[PDB]
Design a protein around this ligand. Structure first.
Ligand SMILES: CCCCCCCC/C=C\CCCCCCCC(=O)OC[C@H](O)CO
Ligand SMILES: CCCCCCCC/C=C\CCCCCCCC(=O)OC[C@H](O)CO
Ligand SMILES: CCCCCCCC/C=C\CCCCCCCC(=O)OC[C@H](O)CO
Ligand SMILES: [Mg+2]
Lengths: 179, 178
């Protein structure tokens, strides 16, 4: 409604539902991390890079979403184009992944964690790649469902990327460090 | 920049610079966590709640920002109305913080870390409270600086919430676990 004419309790009632849904979805991350407690306890430094990994996926996805939302609005793209966009973006995400990975591997090299060099390097590439597709396709899904991306797309991409990003990161870590 | 006529390489060049800046800025969080390696070592379960703590903050901040950006764009609010918003959002942020904290506390108890009930519980309240303020004020700071908030708020709020969110969580953890 109108912010100028809404009270604190009113704003709370208007915002709480969507935040409760998101956190209930976000709680899964804590379950995912606990399931990988063996690798986490063995190599403490794995925890150090969780925000950057997931945060970079969130940036990448939401950057992708903003582009697709704009194109659909201006009728530069139609709903039927989601497959063509999917095929092109998977090429864009790979390039973005390899680029950003190079920088983060350098950071890990600086911090002095040689075992995490391939772990963080591989994972970020996959994270940026998958976060990019999710960000690219989500506006197509919301337009089809009749939902407006404005207050929905950004946190959805971020929460989905956190969950997917953790699953990728921790699996790579397990495979390379515990196997 | 027309998307339908732009190739993969073209899209790549037009996107990297902003993503490169964001990850370089984001690297701060990595150093922050290393500075609190002591508590991370002491309690492993401390790391289990980092993404949900920072994620909830980012969502909270993006929400309040999106509301303010809309109010300023539709002339529902003036730039000079920042103080009124700030005072109102203190109440909204507290209520939101208390509500979400109650839920996350249940999850910590579900996960089986009663040790982490107070630290995670208090932290989310503080995180939501401050993330909501950052979100509500950033459009005001941006427009006053000659930059429309709708273009750059979302990456900014997420990064600020991650950095400040970590600092709150880990400092609370340090005080109560050490
Ligand atoms: C084999 C590793 C590949 C090397 C890639 C090098 C790229 C370096 C770019 C930024 C690193 C920033 C690190 C920041 C270090 C100071 C942090 C304190
Ligand atoms: C999950 C991976 C891709 C999401 C698929 C995109 C979902 C968006 C559906 C787009 C769509 O419904 O557009 C008409 C299409 O041709 C038929 O329905
Ligand atoms: C905390 C940061 C709050 C930043 C608030 C900026 C306020 C501003 O942009 O100025 C509006 C008005 O012109 C000045 O009274
Ligand atoms: Mg985030």
């Amino acid at each position: 409604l109108v912010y100028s004419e809404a009270g604190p309790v009113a704003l709370w009632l208007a915002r709480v539902r969507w935040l409760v849904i998101l956190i209930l979805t976000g709680m899964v991350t804590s379950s995912i991390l606990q399931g990988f407690e063996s690798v986490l306890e063995a190599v403490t430094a794995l925890a150090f890079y969780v925000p950057v990994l997931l945060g970079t996926g969130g940036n990448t996805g939401n950057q992708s979403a903003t582009l697709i939302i704009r194109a659909l609005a201006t009728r530069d793209l139609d709903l039927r184009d989601w497959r063509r966009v999917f095929l092109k973006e998977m090429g864009v995400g790979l390039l973005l992944g390899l680029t950003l990975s190079f920088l983060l591997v350098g950071k890990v090299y600086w911090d002095g964690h040689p075992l995490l060099l391939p772990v963080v390097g591989v994972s970020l590439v996959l994270i940026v790649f998958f976060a990019n597709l999710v960000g690219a396709m989500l506006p197509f899904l919301l337009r089809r469902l009749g939902v407006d991306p404005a207050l929905v797309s950004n946190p959805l991409v971020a929460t989905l990327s956190d969950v997917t990003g953790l699953l990728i990161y921790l699996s790579v870590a397990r495979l390379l460090l515990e196997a």
